Amino acid sequence: KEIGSASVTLLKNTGSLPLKHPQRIAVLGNDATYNVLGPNACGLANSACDIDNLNGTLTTGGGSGSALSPYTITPLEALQKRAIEDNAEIAAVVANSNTTTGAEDAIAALLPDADVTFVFLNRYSEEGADAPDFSLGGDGDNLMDLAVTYSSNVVVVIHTTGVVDIEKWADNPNVTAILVAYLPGQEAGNSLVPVLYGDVAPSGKLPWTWGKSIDDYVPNGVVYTDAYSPQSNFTEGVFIDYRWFDKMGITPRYEFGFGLSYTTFTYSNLIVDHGRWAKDYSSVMETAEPFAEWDGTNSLYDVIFTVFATITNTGNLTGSEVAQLYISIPGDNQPVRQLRGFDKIKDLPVGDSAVVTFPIRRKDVSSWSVVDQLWYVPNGDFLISVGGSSRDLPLNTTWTP
Amino acid sequence: QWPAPLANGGKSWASAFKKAKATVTEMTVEELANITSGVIGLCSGVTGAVTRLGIPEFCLQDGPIGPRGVHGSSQFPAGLTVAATWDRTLMYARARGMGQEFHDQGVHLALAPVTGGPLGRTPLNGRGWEGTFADPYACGEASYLSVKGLTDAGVATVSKHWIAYEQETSRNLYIDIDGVSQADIQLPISSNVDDLTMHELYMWSFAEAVRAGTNHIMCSYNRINNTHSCSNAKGLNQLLKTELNFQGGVVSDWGGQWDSVPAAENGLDVAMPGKGFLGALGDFWGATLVELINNGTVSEDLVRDKAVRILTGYYYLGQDTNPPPPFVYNTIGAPTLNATSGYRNVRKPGTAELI
Ligand SMILES: *[C@@H]1O[C@H](CO)[C@@H](O[C@@H]2O[C@H](CO)[C@@H](O[C@@H]3O[C@H](CO)[C@@H](O)[C@H](O[C@H]4O[C@H](CO)[C@@H](O)[C@H](O)[C@@H]4O[C@H]4O[C@H](CO)[C@@H](O)[C@H](O)[C@@H]4O)[C@@H]3O)[C@H](O)[C@H]2NC(C)=O)[C@H](O)[C@H]1NC(C)=O
Ligand SMILES: CC(=O)O[C@@]12CO[C@@H]1C[C@H](O)[C@@]1(C)C(=O)[C@H](O)C3=C(C)[C@@H](OC(=O)[C@H](O)[C@@H](NC(=O)c4ccccc4)c4ccccc4)C[C@@](O)([C@@H](OC(=O)c4ccccc4)[C@H]21)C3(C)C
Ligand SMILES: *[C@@H]1O[C@H](CO)[C@@H](O[C@@H]2O[C@H](CO)[C@@H](O[C@H]3O[C@H](CO)[C@@H](O)[C@H](O)[C@@H]3O)[C@H](O)[C@H]2NC(C)=O)[C@H](O)[C@H]1NC(C)=O
Ligand SMILES: *[C@@H]1O[C@H](CO)[C@@H](O[C@@H]2O[C@H](CO)[C@@H](O)[C@H](O)[C@H]2NC(C)=O)[C@H](O)[C@H]1NC(C)=O
Ligand SMILES: OC[C@H]1O[C@@H](O[C@@H]2[C@H](O)[C@@H](O)O[C@H](CO)[C@H]2O)[C@@H](O)[C@@H](O)[C@@H]1O
Ligand SMILES: *[C@@H]1O[C@H](CO)[C@@H](O)[C@H](O)[C@H]1NC(C)=O
Ligand SMILES: *[C@@H]1O[C@H](CO)[C@@H](O)[C@H](O)[C@H]1NC(C)=O
Ligand SMILES: *[C@@H]1O[C@H](CO)[C@@H](O)[C@H](O)[C@H]1NC(C)=O
Ligand SMILES: *[C@@H]1O[C@H](CO)[C@@H](O)[C@H](O)[C@H]1NC(C)=O
Ligand SMILES: *[C@@H]1O[C@H](CO)[C@@H](O)[C@H](O)[C@H]1NC(C)=O
Numbered sequence: 104k105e106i107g108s109a110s111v112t113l114l115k116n117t118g119s120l121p122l123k124h125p126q127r128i129a130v131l132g133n134d135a136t137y138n139v140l141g142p143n144a145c146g147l148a149n150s151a152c153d154i155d156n157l158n159g160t161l162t163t164g165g166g167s168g169s170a171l172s173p174y175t176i177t178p179l180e181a182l183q184k185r186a187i188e189d190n191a192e193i194a195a196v197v198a199n200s201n202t203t204t205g206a207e208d209a210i211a212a213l214l215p216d217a218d219v220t221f222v223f224l225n226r227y228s229e230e231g232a233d234a235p236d237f238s239l240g241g242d243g244d245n246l247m248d249l250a251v252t253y254s255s256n257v258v259v260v261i262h263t264t265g266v267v268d269i270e271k272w273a274d275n276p277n278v279t280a281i282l283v284a285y286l287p288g289q290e291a292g293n294s295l296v297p298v299l300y301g302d303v304a305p306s307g308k309l310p311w312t313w314g315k316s317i318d319d320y321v322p323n324g325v326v327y328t329d330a331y332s333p334q335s336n337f338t339e340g341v342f343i344d345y346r347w348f349d350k351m352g353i354t355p356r357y358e359f360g361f362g363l364s365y366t367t368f369t370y371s372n373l374i375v376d377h378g379r380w381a382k383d384y385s386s387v388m389e390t391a392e393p394f395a396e397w398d399g400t401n402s403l404y405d406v407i408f409t410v411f412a413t414i415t416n417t418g419n420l421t422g423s424e425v426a427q428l429y430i431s432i433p434g435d436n437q438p439v440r441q442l443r444g445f446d447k448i449k450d451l452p453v454g455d456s457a458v459v460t461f462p463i464r465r466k467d468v469s470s471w472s473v474v475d476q477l478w479y480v481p482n483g484d485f486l487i488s489v490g491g492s493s494r495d496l497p498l499n500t501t502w503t504p
Numbered sequence: 505q506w507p508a509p510l511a512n513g514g515k516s517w518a519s520a521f522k523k524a525k526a527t528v529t530e531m532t533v534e535e536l537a538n539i540t541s542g543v544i545g546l547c548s549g550v551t552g553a554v555t556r557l558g559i560p561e562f563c564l565q566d567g568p569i570g571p572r573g574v575h576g577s578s579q580f581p582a583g584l585t586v587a588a589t590w591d592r593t594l595m596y597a598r599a600r601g602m603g604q605e606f607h608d609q610g611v612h613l614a615l616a617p618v619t620g621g622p623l624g625r626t627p628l629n630g631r632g633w634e635g636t637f638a639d640p641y642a643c644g645e646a647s648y649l650s651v652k653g654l655t656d657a658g659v660a661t662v663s664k665h666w667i668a669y670e671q672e673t674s675r676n677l678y679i680d681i682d683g684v685s686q687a688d689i690q691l692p693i694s695s696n697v698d699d700l701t702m703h704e705l706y707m708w709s710f711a712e713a714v715r716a717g718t719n720h721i722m723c724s725y726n727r728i729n730n731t732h733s734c735s736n737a738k739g740l741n742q743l744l745k746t747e748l749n750f751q752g753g754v755v756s757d758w759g760g761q762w763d764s765v766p767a768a769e770n771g772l773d774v775a776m777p778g779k780g781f782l783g784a785l786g787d788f789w790g791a792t793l794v795e796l797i798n799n800g801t802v803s804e805d806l807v808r809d810k811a812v813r814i815l816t817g818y819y820y821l822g823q824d825t826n827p828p829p830p831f832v833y834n835t836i837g838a839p840t841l842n843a844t845s846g847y848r849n850v851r852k853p854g855t856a857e858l859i
Contacts, residue, residue, distance in 0.1 A: 126849065127575070190851055192575065216575075216845075 107287035107294020109423075112307040113363040119256055119279035121301025121365055125218035128186055129254065130195035131210065131246050133157040134223035134262055135179040142172040150229050157199060157241070158227065160291045161262035165229025172289050178223055178260065181292030185300055200242045200249060207249065214253035222250045226263040233325045237268030237317055244271070251277045260284060260295065266313050273356065283309075301365065306423035306447070308362030308492065312345045314355040321347050341438060345493050349439040360427045360442070361492040366418025366453070370426075370490055372411075373498040379409035383464070394469065395479035403469070403478055406462040410444070412489045412498060413458055416451045424448050426459040427490060433483025434470055440488060443467045459489070480504060506742040508771065511812050514751040516717055520820035521751070524812045530557055533797050536807045539814060541790040542778025546834050546843060548572070548615060549758070549776040551814065562818070563831045564662070564755070564776065568616035568634050570602045571609045573835030576849035578605065580859055583618055587636035587646055594858075595636075595646045599653020601855050606659045608850040610831035612823055613660045613720065613755075619647035620709025621665035621724055630672040640705055644712035651716035658826070660719035660817035662755050667706050667739060668695035669724035677725050677759030681784040687762065694727040702743070711748055719817035720753040723772065725760045734760045740771020753813035759785035764792050768802050773810035781840060 113120070138144050138152075138159035145152040149169035152158055160177055163169045179195050186193040194213055200206045214220050224243040228234050239247075250257045251272055261267060261283040272278050282305065287294050298305045314320055321339045328334075342350050345359035383404035392403050414424050428444035431437070444461030451457055468485060469478045484503050490496035513521025528536075531554060538552030539559065549564035566572040569580045580602055586595045599617065606614045622629045624638030632638075636646040647663070654661045669675070676692040679685070697706065710721070721744065723734035733739060734756050744750045753773040761767050761775055767788065775789040796802040818824060832846030 126847070187856075190849065 104290035104294045107284065107290055108297055108303055110287065110307040111282055111284040111295055111298050111305055112309060112361075113280070113282050113305040114309075114313070114357050114361070115273065115278065115281040116363055116365075117276070117279045119219065119258060120299060121304075122219065122299055124189045124191070126189070126191045127216055127218045128182065128191060128193040129214050129217035129220040130179055130182060130193065130197070130223070131200075131220065131250055132223035132225075132243070133197045133199070133241065134160055134225040134260075135182075135195055135221065136160070136177045136197045137175060142175045148230075150231070155199075155202075155241070157197075158225075160223070161225035161227055161240075161264075161286065162288050162291050163286050164264045165227060165231075167230055174289060176290050176292040176294075178221070178292040178295055181296040182221065185296050200245045202242075210249050211253055214250065217254060217256075219256045219258060220250055220254040222246050222257055222259050224259060224261050224263075224267070226261070226265070226267045228264040234265065237266060239267055239269075247272050251275050255279075258282075258299070262286065262291070266311065268317075270315060270356075301420075304365040304420060304422035305362065306364065306425065308360050308425050309357055310359075312348050312355045312359045312493075313357035313361075314348065314353070319348065319351075319353045319355065340436070346438040346441070349493070358495075359493040360425070360445075361495070362425070364418070364420075364422040364424065366416055366420045366422040368422075368424045368451070368491065369415045369417040370412060370497045371415065372413040373487075373489060373500050374411040375408060375487060375500060375502060376411060377408050379406075379462075381406050381462075392466075393477040394465070395472075395477060396465070403466040404464045407465045407468070408463050408502075410461045410463060410487060410489070411458055413456055414448060414451065415456045416453050419453060421450055421452055423450055424491070427492065427496075428461045429488045429493065429496065430463075430468060431486035431488075432468060432470060432481060433485065434481050437470075440486070440493070442493070461489075506737040506746075506770075508741050508769070508806065508809065509746050510809055511751050511816065513816065514749065517751055517816050517820045520816050520818075521812070523819040523824075524815035527554075527557060527559065527815055528808050528811045531808070531811060533794055533804060533807075536797070536804070536811050537790055537793040540773065540793065540807060540810050541775040541787075542780050544779050544841070546831050546836065546841070546845075547611065548835060549613075549755075549778070549780060551774070559815070559818070560827070562612040562814075563610055563828070564613040564615055565606065565609070565611040565831070565835065566615045568618050568664075571606050571611055571614075573837075574609050574833045574850075575845075575847060576851065577609065578851050578855045578859060582633045583636045583646070583650070584633040587642065590642075592645065592649055595649040596653045597858055599650040600657050601653075601858055603654040603657020603659050604852065605850050605855075606654070607657055607828055609833075609848060610828045611659055612818070612828055613662050614654050615662050615664065615722065615755075616654065617647060617650035617661065617663060618665070619643070619650070619663040619713040619718070620706060621667050621669040623670070623706060623709065625670035629670065640708035643709040647709045648712040648716040651713050651718045655717050655719070655821065658821050658823075658828075660821055660823075661713075662720040662722050663710065663713040663718040664722035665724035665757060666710060666721045666733060666744065666754075667724060668697050668702070668728050669726050669733070670695060671726075675725035677757065678762050678786040679759055679784055680786065681782075686759075692725055692727045692732065694730045696729050707743065707748070710744070714744075714748045714750050718752065719820070720755050720774075720813075721750065722755045722757055723760055725757050732760070732762045732766075734772050735763055735766040735770045737770035745771060751813070752816060753810065761786055761788055764788040764796060765801060768793065768796070768806060768810075773813045780836065 150165040226240045258280045383402045429440035488496040547563035551562040618634040674693045755774040834843045
């Protein structure tokens with residue numbers, strides 16, 4: 104559960120979250136409730152259910168990295184627990200909205216009087232095939248169209264195996280909040296509702312880039328060919344995800360390492376401490392990785408320096424903050440920046456400050472010599488940037504060894 | 505034949521009767537027809553105000569598990585369900601709880617409970633679940649207690665359905681929608697019931713209902729010996745109003761009134777729903793009753809008894825000095841009624857655990 108509550112990521116919030124004590128709650132989407140055939144209906148690999156089946160809350164993906172469930176704690180059941188505590192009413196349409204007789208009529212009638220409308224969306228994928236685009240699973244496009252027609256307070260919650268296309272509605276003023284919650288396992292619903300009701304502020308951030316379009320990603324991501332010897336050439340090199348997005352100058356929807364809270368954090372007092380170094384003595388096994396500065400005592404993974412910064416909860420509510428550190432290694436055709444540290448502060452009171460610390464190892468500031476076939480620390484001007492996301496970096500400094 | 509015995513207030517309603525008579529005495533013929541016939545509003549039925557004497561519209565509201573078509577309330581178990589408890593305490597508390605929710609939603613008259621019509625001649629009865637037991641004794645007991653619960657909570661009851669209303673098939677309520685009329689198409693099923701059976705089986709629960717102080721009774725859609733229940737003189741004027749000494753009002757089921765004059769003469773006191781439901785369910789009194797009085801066909805005093813029977817409940821349950829709050833929900837539904845709804849939360853601690 105605590106994993107779910109720490110992961111769930113807030114992408115948009117025009118004022119609707121956290122919920123106070125809404126009296127009339129509307130829920131949309133089979134994602135909000137059980138698989139109609141049972142949590143384990145899809146079998147040993149969570150891939151045997153029909154393509155149109157209502158599989159319910161998307162708690163894991165398809166294939167060999169799935170597992171059986173003792174139960175699922177559905178969002179609806181958890182939302183209901185909370186409604187009942189508030190002496191409120193709650194109603195869910197969980198059928199296929201396109202194919203079920205009266206579904207659309209029901210939604211039209213249910214939503215206008217709701218204080219808030221949740222829409223649960225999912226996007227299953229699996230081992231054995233690739234997603235054909237950023238397409239919402241089942242009836243999700245429809246759900247969303249209906250929802251914004253009849254309600255001005257839609258809160259979208261996505262259970263997905265990756266980025267999905269929400270371009271149609273993400274800038275609709277009627278969509279007041281959007282959250283992704285990934286694949287939260289069995290404690291799906293009870294990990295989420297605390298966040299929505301504001302018992303714990305959301306603290307999770309995107310572990311990849313949310314581009315406005317599949318066309319903004321590394322070309323030829325999937326090659327389709329009947330050719331007896333199929334060929335993908337990684338001609339983009341090191342430039343995947345936000346590295347690609349950064350180098351090409353492409354603004355995504357939501358950047359790598361982005362995710363809102365219910366409060367704001369102000370960054371301050373950047374500090375690089377050259378005296379804060381230490382030898383790697385802890386790791387279980389060692390590589391035979393070659394590097395310039397090697398002298399028979401030392402390591403690629405020695406922490407050469409350490410960098411510090413200060414966050415201040417400048418908001419109105421307690422909240423956790425994932426601080427990120429990026430470095431610009433100099434060189435030719437070198438990423439605009441690369442993440443070389445993160446430190447999550449837990450539950451920072453309003454007005455309070457905490458120090459963020461980042462141990463930079465040697466390898467963290469090195470390049471591969473193609474010619475000499477070793478790791479070496481380049482010369483040049485290293486940019487160090489610290490902040491909230493891969494594009495929210497209010498503190499830079501420069502280092503030159 | 506069987507004349508209409510005048511109301512006198514009985515045992516418990518003595519002072520309420522006398523306030524009712526007093527008020528009715530002041531009423532014009534228009535006022536009499538205003539209160540004895542349904543008008544348009546948010547509740548299942550609504551009596552016209554007597555606005556010059558400050559009598560307001562009465563909200564009549566379904567139904568026998570609690571106020572229907574409202575938000576902010578609880579869904580109680582059915583009569584069938586309490587019956588199965590065989591627990592008098594639960595039967596009472598159920599009704600008492602239904603009662604506070606009716607009162608607090610703003611209902612003057614609860615179209616409840618179901619007290620032996622249908623009782624259960626057929627196990628296929630579509631609405632048999634609204635009643636209790638398939639047994640006069642047990643149904644009488646539950647009916648007594650169901651009535652007491654609602655009335656103790658400050659809501660007039662309309663026990664239903666009188667009587668011998670034992671199948672839904674071809675009840676054939678009165679409806680004159682489109683061009684077509686049910687009266688042209690097919691008469692209601694006629695329950696034809698000997699006098700022992702009527703006494704020993706069907707009347708038994710209603711006797712209990714009367715004894716508990718049900719303020720009103722709703723006459724059923726079926727006909728009895730080929731006369732409509734709502735204009736059956738033997739059934740309403742003699743069996744109910746004389747032998748069971750019933751002191752309250754007979755409300756038509758919605759389209760259970762088929763005529764103007766026999767109804768006025770043979771026991772009916774309230775025409776429902778009147779102007780409600782686009783007038784589609786019959787509208788036999790109102791302006792028609794005004795005409796019939798003014799031209800000597802129907803005695804004004806006959807209609808004053810009806811209005812007295814209506815006001816008796818008003819005054820007895822203290823709705824005059826302690827009025828229910830405004831009713832806030834459109835329970836009729838668009839496009840039949842195009843009115844916006846408010847919101848009121850009426851759920852109280854204790855109700856969920858009682859259920
Ligand atoms: C539906 O139709 C059924 C079937 O016909 C109806 O059932 C009939 O109901 C009537 C009552 O309305 C009933 O009438 C009696 O028959 C008895 C003989 O079988 C008569 O003895 C009895 O008469 C006495 O009662 C009358 C009414 O008060 C008096 O006017 C009359 O003078 C008699 O009473 C005196 O004598 C007795 C002593 O003998 C004394 O105790 C009295 O106090 C008084 O001094 C009835 O007339 C029929 O018998 C019923 N038939 C059947 C088969 O049941 C039913 O009523 C209809 N239902 C509706 C809603 O209309
Ligand atoms: C083919 C394959 O991927 O097999 C394995 C078995 O170990 C492999 C690794 C894989 O992790 C594993 C266990 C999974 O967990 C997968 O999620 C998984 C799959 C990807 C799936 O694979 C497929 O559907 C195959 O492409 C499919 N293959 C073909 O039909 C085929 C024919 C000609 C050319 C190429 C392919 C197949 C379907 C059903 C039974 C056997 C083979 C089979 C499989 O049943 C599962 O396979 C079997 O259970 C199985 C395979 C062969 C014989 C008997 C049983 C699958 C599941 C559980 C559904
Ligand atoms: C509910 O879960 C189902 C898994 O148990 C899922 O069905 C599977 O969906 C995928 C698409 O994500 C299908 O993928 C394949 O489609 C055709 C197969 O002929 C190929 O062109 C593709 O390359 C791809 O491999 C699976 O076929 C399908 N599984 C079965 C047995 O039908 C449902 O889609 C899930 N429901 C929803 C609404 O998301
Ligand atoms: C006959 O009854 C109707 C139905 O209520 C009366 O009119 C309403 O009067 C109330 C006050 O009692 C007003 O608030 C409403 O505005 C009236 N409604 C309508 C539809 O106009 C009517 O007043 C009654 N007439 C008499 C003579 O008492
Ligand atoms: O609208 C009511 C449903 O009735 C279904 O049928 C009933 C039976 O034919 C039989 O018991 O008679 C009653 C009427 O006396 C019917 O209502 C059937 O007709 C469905 O179409 C209706 O949904
Ligand atoms: C937003 O919702 C309202 C109903 O609350 C609807 O009338 C309006 O069309 C919607 N607008 C957009 C931009 O979807
Ligand atoms: C991609 O691979 C094909 C297959 O050998 C090759 O012909 C083509 O030139 C390659 N292009 C690159 C590496 O950019
Ligand atoms: C009295 O009025 C009613 C209804 O308006 C009408 O049916 C009846 O025939 C009238 N009778 C007389 C004697 O005018
Ligand atoms: C006089 O009798 C006629 C029926 O013959 C009736 O219409 C009228 O109302 C009667 N008057 C009385 C007794 O009130
Ligand atoms: C209510 O509105 C509908 C559609 O707007 C209209 O057709 C209907 O006549 C109205 N109902 C009444 C009773 O006026």
